Amino acid sequence: PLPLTALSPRRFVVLLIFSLYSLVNAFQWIQYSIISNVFEGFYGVTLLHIDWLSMVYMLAYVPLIFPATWLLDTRGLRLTALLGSGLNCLGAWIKCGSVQQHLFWVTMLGQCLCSVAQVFILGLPSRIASVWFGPKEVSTACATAVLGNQLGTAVGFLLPPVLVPNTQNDTNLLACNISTMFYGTSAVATLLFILTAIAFKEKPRYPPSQAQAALQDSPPEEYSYKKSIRNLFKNIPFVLLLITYGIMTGAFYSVSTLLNQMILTYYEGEEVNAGRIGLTLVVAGMVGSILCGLWLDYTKTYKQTTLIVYILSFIGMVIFTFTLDLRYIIIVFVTGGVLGFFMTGYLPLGFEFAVEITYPESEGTSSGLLNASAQIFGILFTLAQGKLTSDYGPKAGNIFLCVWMFIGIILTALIKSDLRRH
Numbered sequence: 001p002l003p004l005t006a007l008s009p010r011r012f013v014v015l016l017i018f019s020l021y022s023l024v025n026a027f028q029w030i031q032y033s034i035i036s037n038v039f040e041g042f043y044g045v046t047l048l049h050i051d052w053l054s055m056v057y058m059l060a061y062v063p064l065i066f067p068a069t070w071l072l073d074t075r076g077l078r079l080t081a082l083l084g085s086g087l088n089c090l091g092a093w094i095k096c097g098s099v100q101q102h103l104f105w106v107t108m109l110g111q112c113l114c115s116v117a118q119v120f121i122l123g124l125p126s127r128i129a130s131v132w133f134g135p136k137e138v139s140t141a142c143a144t145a146v147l148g149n150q151l152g153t154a155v156g157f158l159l160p161p162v163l164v165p166n167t168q169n170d171t172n173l174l175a176c177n178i179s180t181m182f183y184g185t186s187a188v189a190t191l192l193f194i195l196t197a198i199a200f201k202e203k204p205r206y207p208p209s210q211a212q213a214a215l216q217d218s219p220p221e222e223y224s225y226k227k228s229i230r231n232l233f234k235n236i237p238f239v240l241l242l243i244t245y246g247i248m249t250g251a252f253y254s255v256s257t258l259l260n261q262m263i264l265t266y267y268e269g270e271e272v273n274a275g276r277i278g279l280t281l282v283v284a285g286m287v288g289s290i291l292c293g294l295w296l297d298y299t300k301t302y303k304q305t306t307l308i309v310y311i312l313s314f315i316g317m318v319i320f321t322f323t324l325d326l327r328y329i330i331i332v333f334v335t336g337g338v339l340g341f342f343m344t345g346y347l348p349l350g351f352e353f354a355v356e357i358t359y360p361e362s363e364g365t366s367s368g369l370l371n372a373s374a375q376i377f378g379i380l381f382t383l384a385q386g387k388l389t390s391d392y393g394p395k396a397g398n399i400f401l402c403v404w405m406f407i408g409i410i411l412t413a414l415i416k417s418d419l420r421r422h
């Protein structure tokens with residue numbers, strides 16, 4: 001109680017503003033893929049181009065996460081938030097000027113800018129929660145921050161199909177709809193960036209928590225990211241957890257990117273239904289994350305719960321694979337909901353397991369490695385599954401995903417640890 005601790009209303013504002021612009025970023029990640037056929041027709045490109053529009057996020061994250069983490073640690077929260085918001089706004093504005101049949105590269109540049117923004121955006125939740133919220137409010141603030149990005153992904157799934165119908169016959173109408181969507185996104189991003197500039201302060205006048213007061217009082221300490229990574233790789237259980245988490249997240253990313261292709265293969269004129277399926281998957285994933293966190297809290301064992309969740313995710317993936325072609329959209333809805341539930345439920349559990357197993361290694365390095373593995377696996381799975389679907393049909397790529405999930409289960413079982421919640 002020696003230092004003075006107080007809570008300011010501005011924290012909520014900050015938690016809102018980030019949760020908004022981060023949301024927007026997530027939207028921009030999946031806007032193209034969900035209507036990938038429409039953009040393919042408009043730009044006269046192949047589906048691989050639209051897949052790369054989504055994979056640029058993953059590609060940009062891998063080489064910039066560690067530099068971004070260092071910048072956040074050294075310069076503070078405000079600079080990172082401003083960078084993320086401004087980059088997202090600039091990417092949206094560039095996309096606004098990319099609405100033409102011969103200007104795909106402008107949209108690619110805007111998407112790359114949004115990808116660079118994501119690197120700054122993704123790391124802010126926990127740091128903001130610690131800096132601006134008290135001990136009891138930290139968990140809720142972090143949950144809201146992550147839910148912002150998840151809701152952004154869900155909205156990116158749902159909205160573009162409604163906003164941009166597949167009017168390939170009329171180029172003017174398609175261009176007008178794409179321009180409307182881009183201008184709306186740009187306006188929202190600009191407003192959020194202005195709000196971040198005006199109100200997003202570095203930290204409150206007084207620390208919200210005693211732990212935050214101690215952290216701020218402590219002098220800065222330099223950390224060697226390379227040494228931390230080398231020590232982490234020595235931990236074979238952590239390597240196995242990294243591989244499994246990357247496999248699962250990459251499978252989710254590949255399914256999200258190629259969902260439109262799989263749905264359009266068997267159901268025609270169902271882009272809106274595909275977006276609804278994606279939104280159902282994301283919402284079920286949120287619910288599964290909450291329920292799996294509760295299950296882990298009750299049972300208190302990382303290994304058993306993680307393995308069971310992985311097995312359930314594999315079963316759901318197989319069910320979706322072998323039910324997609326039944327030509328019933330409701331079955332696709334249910335299977336996608338179950339699959340997203342289990343897949344997104346796995347992610348927090350695996351992340352916590354990897355963070356705890358790596359102790360006392362810095363959480364930043366482990367988080368960066370986990371996310372980089374997720375991005376790499378997502379890129380590889382997206383490429384392989386897209387090629388398989390184009391050449392042999394969605395079932396081949398889905399079976400490839402199922403095989404990778406089975407390999408992930410095998411790796412998870414091989415993990416040797418008795419770690420328990422403390």
Ligand SMILES: CC(C)CCC[C@@H](C)[C@H]1CC[C@H]2[C@@H]3CC=C4C[C@@H](OC(=O)CCC(=O)O)CC[C@]4(C)[C@H]3CC[C@]12C
Nearest residue numbers: 046048049052053056057059060108111112113115116
């Ligand atoms: C600044 C950071 C975020 C990195 C940004 C990198 C991108 C500008 C690069 C990385 C991978 C590239 C893609 C890698 C492979 C392809 C497939 C390629 O396909 C063809 O040329 C097919 C031609 C045919 O149809 O015969 C077209 C370019 C494209 C989309 C590339 C476009 C430019 C990309 C997205």
Ligand SMILES: CC(C)CCC[C@@H](C)[C@H]1CC[C@H]2[C@@H]3CC=C4C[C@@H](OC(=O)CCC(=O)O)CC[C@]4(C)[C@H]3CC[C@]12C
Nearest residue numbers: 062063066067225226229242243246369372373376377
């Ligand atoms: C498990 C599979 C699927 C993914 C494995 C990924 C790693 C092997 C790669 C991915 C990103 C890489 C990092 C990307 C950027 C940098 C910054 C780079 O900075 C420097 O050159 C200076 C470092 C210093 O200050 O000592 C050092 C290597 C490092 C940490 C890299 C180390 C190796 C990493 C973690």
Ligand SMILES: CC(C)CCC[C@@H](C)[C@H]1CC[C@H]2[C@@H]3CC=C4C[C@@H](OC(=O)CCC(=O)O)CC[C@]4(C)[C@H]3CC[C@]12C
Nearest residue numbers: 384388391392393395396397398399400401403404407
């Ligand atoms: C850990 C990594 C290295 C695993 C890689 C596994 C791939 C080599 C497998 C996984 C899914 C397989 C595909 C699943 C389904 C099919 C459909 C299949 O269709 C056919 O024409 C033959 C069967 C039939 O008659 O229906 C042809 C092989 C193919 C593309 C398979 C080719 C081999 C794939 C890509």
